[PDB]
A paper describes a structure:
Intracellular leucine aminopeptidases (PepA) are metalloproteases from the family M17. Here, we dissected the catalytic and chemical mechanisms of PaPepA: a leucine aminopeptidase from Pseudomonas aeruginosa. Solved structures reveal the presence of a PaPepA hexamer, which displays high similarity with E. coli, bovine lens, and P. putida PepA hexamers (RMSD between 0.4 and 0.5 in comparison to PaPepA).
Mn2+ was pentacoordinated in unliganded enzyme and hexacoordinated when bound to bestatin, but distances from coordinating residues remained the same, showing little to no distortion in the metal binding site and coordinating residues brought upon by ligand binding. CheckmyMetal57 revealed that the metal binding sites for PaPepA are optimal for Mn2+. If the metal is replaced by Zn2+, a large RMSD of observed geometry angles (ligand–metal–ligand angles) compared to ideal geometry is seen, further arguing against Zn2+ as a viable metal. RMSD between apo and bestatin-bound PaPepA is 0.21 Å, and the RMSD between the apo structure and Mn2+ bound PaPepA is 0.21 Å. Analysis of tunnels and cavities in PaPepA using Caver34 revealed six possible tunnels leading to a central catalytic chamber, with three separate paths linking the protein active sites and metal binding centers to the protein surface. In our structures, tunnels contain a narrow portion closer to the active site (3.5 Å diameter on average at their narrowest part), therefore, excluding the possibility of an extensively folded peptide or protein acting as a substrate. Additionally, the location of tunnels highlights the presence of one viable path for peptide binding per PaPepA in the interface between two monomers. Manganese-dependent enzymes with binuclear binding sites, such as PaPepA, coordinate a water molecule between the two manganese atoms. Crystal structures depicting two metals in the active site and the difference in magnitude for KACT and KD values led us to hypothesize that metal occupancy in one site was not sufficient for activation. PaPepA also exists as a hexamer in solution, which was independently determined by dynamic light-scattering analysis.
Numbering used by the authors:
A (entry chain A), B (entry chain F), C (entry chain C), D (entry chain B): 18 to 516
Write the structure that this text describes.
Amino acid sequence: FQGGMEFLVKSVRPETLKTATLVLAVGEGRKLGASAKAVDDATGGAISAVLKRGDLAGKVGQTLLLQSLPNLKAERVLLVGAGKERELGDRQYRKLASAVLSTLKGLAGADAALALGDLAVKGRGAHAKARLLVETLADGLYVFDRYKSQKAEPLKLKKLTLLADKADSAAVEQGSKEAQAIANGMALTRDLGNLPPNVCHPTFLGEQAKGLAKEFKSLKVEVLDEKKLRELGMGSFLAVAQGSDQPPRLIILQYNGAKKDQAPHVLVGKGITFDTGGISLKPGLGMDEMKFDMCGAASVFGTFRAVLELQLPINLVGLLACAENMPSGGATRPGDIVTTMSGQTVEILNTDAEGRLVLCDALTYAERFKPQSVIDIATLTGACIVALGSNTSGLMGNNEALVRQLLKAGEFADDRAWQLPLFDEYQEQLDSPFADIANIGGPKAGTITAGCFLSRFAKKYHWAHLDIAGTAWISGGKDKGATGRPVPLLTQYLLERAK
Amino acid sequence: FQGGMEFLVKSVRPETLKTATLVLAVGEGRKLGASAKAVDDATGGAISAVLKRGDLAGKVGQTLLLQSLPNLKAERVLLVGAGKERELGDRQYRKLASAVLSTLKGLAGADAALALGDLAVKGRGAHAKARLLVETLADGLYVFDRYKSQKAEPLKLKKLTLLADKADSAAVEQGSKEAQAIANGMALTRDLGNLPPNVCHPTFLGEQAKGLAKEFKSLKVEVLDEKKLRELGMGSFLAVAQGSDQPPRLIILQYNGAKKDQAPHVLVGKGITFDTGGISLKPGLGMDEMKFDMCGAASVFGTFRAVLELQLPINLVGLLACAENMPSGGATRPGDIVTTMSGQTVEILNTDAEGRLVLCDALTYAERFKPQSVIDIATLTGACIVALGSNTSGLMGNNEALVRQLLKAGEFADDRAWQLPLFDEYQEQLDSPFADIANIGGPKAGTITAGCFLSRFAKKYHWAHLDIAGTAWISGGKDKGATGRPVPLLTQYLLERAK
Amino acid sequence: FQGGMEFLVKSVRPETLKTATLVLAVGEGRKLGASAKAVDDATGGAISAVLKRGDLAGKVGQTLLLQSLPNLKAERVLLVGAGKERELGDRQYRKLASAVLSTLKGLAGADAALALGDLAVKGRGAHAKARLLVETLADGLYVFDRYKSQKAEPLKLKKLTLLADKADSAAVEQGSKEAQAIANGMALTRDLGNLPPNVCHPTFLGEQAKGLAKEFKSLKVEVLDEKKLRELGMGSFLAVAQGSDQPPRLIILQYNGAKKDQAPHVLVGKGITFDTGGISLKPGLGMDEMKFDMCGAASVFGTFRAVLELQLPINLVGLLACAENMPSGGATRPGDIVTTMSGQTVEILNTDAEGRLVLCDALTYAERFKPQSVIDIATLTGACIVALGSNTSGLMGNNEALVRQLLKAGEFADDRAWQLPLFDEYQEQLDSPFADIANIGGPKAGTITAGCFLSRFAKKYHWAHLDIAGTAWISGGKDKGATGRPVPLLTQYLLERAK
Amino acid sequence: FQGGMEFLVKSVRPETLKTATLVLAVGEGRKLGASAKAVDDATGGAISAVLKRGDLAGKVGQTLLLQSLPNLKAERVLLVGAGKERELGDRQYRKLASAVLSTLKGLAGADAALALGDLAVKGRGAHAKARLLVETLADGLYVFDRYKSQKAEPLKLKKLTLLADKADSAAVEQGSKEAQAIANGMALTRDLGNLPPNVCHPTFLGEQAKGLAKEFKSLKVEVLDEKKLRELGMGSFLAVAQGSDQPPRLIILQYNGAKKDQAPHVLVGKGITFDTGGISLKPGLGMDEMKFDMCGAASVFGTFRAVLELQLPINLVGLLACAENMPSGGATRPGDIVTTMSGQTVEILNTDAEGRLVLCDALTYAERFKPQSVIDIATLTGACIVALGSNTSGLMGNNEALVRQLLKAGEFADDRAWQLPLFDEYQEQLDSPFADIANIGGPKAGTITAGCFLSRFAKKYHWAHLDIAGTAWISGGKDKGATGRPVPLLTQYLLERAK
Ligand SMILES: [Mn+2]
Ligand SMILES: [Mn+2]
Ligand SMILES: [Mn+2]
Ligand SMILES: [Mn+2]
Ligand SMILES: [Mn+2]
Ligand SMILES: [Mn+2]
Ligand SMILES: [Mn+2]
Ligand SMILES: [Mn+2]
Ligand SMILES: [N+]
Ligand SMILES: [N+]
Ligand SMILES: [N+]
Ligand SMILES: [N+]
Ligand SMILES: [N+]
Ligand SMILES: [N+]
Ligand SMILES: [N+]
Ligand SMILES: [N+]
Ligand SMILES: [N+]
Ligand SMILES: [N+]
Ligand SMILES: [N+]
Ligand code: NA
């Protein structure tokens, strides 16, 4: 959006650091770890004297804010509860970080220093903790207000310092730098997802890609229009697009950070900038949330943004299949049969199963790059939400080594996915009496049969499919909006592939 | 519809009046009233002799038709029951009058004389009873047969005489003249509402206003097109119209019957020629009645027609926001954010809440006339039918004096409205995380939330809002069609303001 | 598809006929019939000996396939069970024929000889049986695979011989010749119905009619476009078409096989190439089956094709009213009022009752031919499926003799219809307060009131109406697709009218 | 629940008062008020020095918590923002009070003192501000946890002191005493509403009434079982109950606090302890919220509990009509006709319109008390939520003075209602061809026709009807549960009647 937050790692003593706010952890009910103890001592016991009064039980995320304490160079000391466990899990760690950030946002302090190195998080060393902490803090600063007449008061907080021991400082620094690049990527993804569909159409996304190439000389962009798509034979891509006044776009991103002889990784993103269902029209209730139907393509933008900042030694291709799905006098009809670019014919039984019809033509297009892996990302099926809910993405693929790599990256990022099977027995649900493939398989196993459909275009390479219909946005409440998932998972996968 | 039926007030004796039909009231179980007693005596008791056979019980609206009676100059005598009550209520008086017109319409009499001045109506004097009676009779003669190949046989009845004492004659005459103007306006409103949506589109309504100016030289008319609406920055209005092939129109009516120093009264009407719901498409059952979605604009035409006939000493402005809500490949999508003329940003969560989107821009435009009152009329919410039904109109406003003036006028006209609260606690339902206002507030308090939306565009003037979704038309049966409401309330309001 | 199967009638001894497969009937628990006995004796009881081992119970359609048997010139003998009754019904006869064909299809034999003359069929002589047997066999060979990349293996089976006694062969061969012409017409009807709606639009059907005229020089074709339809005043036909990008067509077919002084029979076909419902949009589930909403017109194609092959001495006219029904910003709205060719005005309460709106203008057009009968065929109401299911067509009409003729033809063809009454009491369900006719009559008696609507345009001639909404296609499963009904009923009607 | 928080009014100086937490208001960008300035002065400018740092913007409900300040006897000072307005609205005042309570709840302080006398609340003097403030604080302490295995930690906070000038202290004292009685009644109401329906059945409510009579010697209780209801002839009440295994109860409460010659006020409460809808079964989703269908009766409990605490000089009668609405083999069927106690026959078209069927027999029973007002309270129609939402109760009545008294009471209580009209034109929606009254009037004006039905049993006295379907509970979120409305309105009505 703008960003700006400076994240610094320092190895200095907390009790003499000049800062507007020093942040210390307090266990249930006091316990005081090493850093907090040293600060207490420096004040002559004022902190333990306050805690003894009992206002802070020490549960995860509780807070107690003190002003000037004797002999400290911190204008304020913020105590945050760390619970009673010796180690926190990932969810408690994030909750603790978010409670700290929420307090700091309301203060007029220009910086804060985090003396949180004494916290233990299950399975996480210094680098893995920094990645989680900094990503939560940086992504927590996200603001989208460009159509609000009354904008939010700018934050006074402009700097966050992570205190670490000198032996850990290099690991914390590296984790912080990667986390910032990921958060910057998610901010781009969230902006693209949150924009209204009358602004964020396929032509607009083409221009956004060209702008990203202006910012990053390492990025090459090409944008194909409908004439080029028809030349290439993308009959099912064009079938989705034809009902709309807005022309479709295929956006190609290319980054060559490795040797010319290294096979590229390809990211394929579903970019339906608004999904009405078409002639198979959706119900009205909640259909404004279909502006998030391009979050797949948005996450390819976000991942490129993070990789371009980090300058990873990999070769990366992004393919964004962008169209708007509208009803009209020239829209695709249920029962239409079209010829995909692969040559397979498809009977379009349901015009609201349109994401797989733009992706399948992009998966055929991807063959030309001779890729060592191909991952498509798409807000594809409501069935995935029934299967896995809103906090775990659906994952399928035709190569188990690649599926394993993506699961592992999702566990490290705390951006988790879960595999569903593409057993051959499911494929017959896509049989059509009239064409090579039907575009829907009926009410059983909807997420899997959608993956089975895509698999038929991905046989020439190692391929996986992330269904992010549940994880790409929040539906309601104060926090309705795009999430930026799965940029953390995708970037961590590429970070490992780059070693 | 031409009408052209003559209403006369006379003070002559009923029993020597030459007429095709003389109409007398007969009470239930009490003595003939003064007039009927005199006619009975004139005939030598022939009427009381017939009534003694017991065919006419005297219940409200029952009738007995007699041919020629001794010593009378009426070719026929129509007896109509008046009930047992000393005073009739408004509904009973209307029912009595409709029973009389029904019988007269089936007769070959060219004229009829009504001797009903002995009837008492609760809270109603001579002028008030005449307003109700003449309005009922004139509007009951309304006929719409434009698209019928077999048109109705013309009525022989062409003159109706109201017999009144010389002391009440002036008041009865003033009531008849005002009631006739109201019924003429109602006939224009009913015609415009009953017209098919393929004929009555926004361009047609602009040509009808130009015709009203050719008939009334005191009326000035300006019709603005989409290009001018864009110069004015009316984004909400243009968003509702973009999906249709039919161009939008803002019709401006201006009548100056008072001095240039008198601030104008502004009437703003919803002119949605047809409401399909848009991308948020409505179900098909009953969608034909969405041709009555321009009855608010039609009510402004009708009130102007009544005021132009009565030449009232007032300055009146009419703003008719006209558009057609249609599904298309260029139609507004749920989630679109638009900038209103006021600069306020609006997130259109539901394309079927488009009436408020054409009215908000019209209310902003109304500010230029420095109005002393601004009243919007719209078939806005079906929640108003759940709240107040089809007999009472919803009324909301930012000024208690204007709301009370409109409620008193509705009580005088027997075209009643009812106030619903615009408490500030309802406004939060229109909160959007992406814009200044959401166009919908949820399943609770729909009528109030629509008024709260319009209130954000009416803060610079005294404003009121009439929801006529349930009162502007009858859904089915043999009397399916436009009602002409709320022209009676609006003309009574303007008559009180002209004094 | 291309057909090609040769049907021959021969009167030779079954046991010396050289054939790839000789087909014999075996009764359940009764002795072999005359033909089967003679073949068994020719083998020395080989067939008796096999049947004694009990593998073939002889239930209708059971089979037992033998290779080479002593002293026969058939490479194979196929035994098919014929049940235990002395006569078969039409359903069992068809079952038997289909089981035989299914076995032959899977064999590598180039021909087969059917020694089935012994079978008896309730109420069917030699000609009636041959009509049923050959039509079932020929139509059973239909294949639609033009959008399958992997096409079916061509059959080895190219010739079928019917063995008949010399006394019967003349009737058998006439039944066979008629059955083949009917099957060829069905194949054309089935192809046109099975084509996807993005290919088979009204312009495509027009070109298909021109192609049929190049094939049969006796056929004259004229294709009218939108401009000519507007010249003719076809307002309700045009209202259906106006929402779509695809222009409408009225296709006129004329065949004069009789003297010029003899009045023609007219077939009027509903050619809605896809039915979305329009603004009154259908639900998405199963909407792909609306490509069959032109099977009415397709059956007129197929009837002409069979009549042209047979060169019947009749004068025959076909009118195919073709349009596509889509939602758009210019589509017809519920509540629109239009003027039909006939001058009657119609209120379009429901844009999904569109078939009768193109048919009524075609019925008026048909007056110019001064016909002696007019039959319209249409997939008109889902209510007919509720009434009569998927195996009996609904039949209505204004002439009792014509209705009787069609029922009798249906019984003979085993393609049955059933009459529903058009009692004048139903007509008032189509009363509109605004026009001469409403296009729908509510939820009661939906098939009948659609018939009553059409009857108002057919008063000048003898007319009947076939509602084939249930019989024109099979909805799901392996055999999903067009049926070709009612070509067999219609052709049998013309055959009888030609005598 | 237990309650028992001590509320005291004192007139001492805030700056020398010994307290665990002193609470002061801070304006947004205006000077500290008198109290707050006195305290700042006594600390030598410590509070103003902190505020200059800028952490507390001063918006309504923002907080800043300080520890020991120099020269104060307060262990802690809580600063709470009061906005920038000179006067607060009721909503802002409650929000401010709730933010203070939320902070105190989390502290270990045993008491707190509130120096908020400088706050102006629009339209409210000392007594009216105290009523609102103390009711918000006391009701905000409510806890319901009897089926949770993990109970909430008891609060340390046990005493709240309101600081007031000696000139206002008597009025603040009186408001505080009334507010705590109202809050105690709401706690009983909320407990009864929150109990699960397998515990809180009609018999249980009867025993609860007896327990209330043990606690308050002024209260007399009578509990009638199904035998007694039938002897009284309450066929409509019994019709609702018969489908359930739980027997019904009519509970009569009587309190005689005035001279025996004062006519009583009667409160009639709908106590449907669970509403399945019966044979007219409700949908499954959200049906758990039908345990709140006895909140009408619970509010009569709560109002008595407050009146008995205050010992008001009034005569008060309570009638709780309690039944459970279940489907079974003996349940009332749609179309049953029953004879009410009044003798009017009712045709039960919908067994889910059951509240009015138990209330109507209670309204007839109420005649024996010769009351000067009768008020029924019922979670009656979901249509009320459509008309007025979740924050305003619907109000209807046969006496304009009584209706105005209740509206005024609700405005003072900030527990508002809104009148809907019972025009005679609505009554005909209850016409039945088979009985004196139908129990439903169709989809229009559902709240009004329900009031119309009840009005037919209330003609012998001044009567009003509160529809609390939207205000009696909260549906979801953290705060799902009964609200205790309209106990504040009813108690304020009784307070004014007792002067
Ligand atoms: Mn979709
Ligand atoms: Mn989609
Ligand atoms: Mn609408
Ligand atoms: Mn509308
Ligand atoms: Mn249709
Ligand atoms: Mn159709
Ligand atoms: Mn109920
Ligand atoms: Mn209930
Ligand atoms: N402090
Ligand atoms: N955790
Ligand atoms: N693989
Ligand atoms: N990883
Ligand atoms: N996202
Ligand atoms: N309107
Ligand atoms: N059969
Ligand atoms: N022709
Ligand atoms: N026949
Ligand atoms: N029917
Ligand atoms: N009855
Ligand atoms: Na989707």
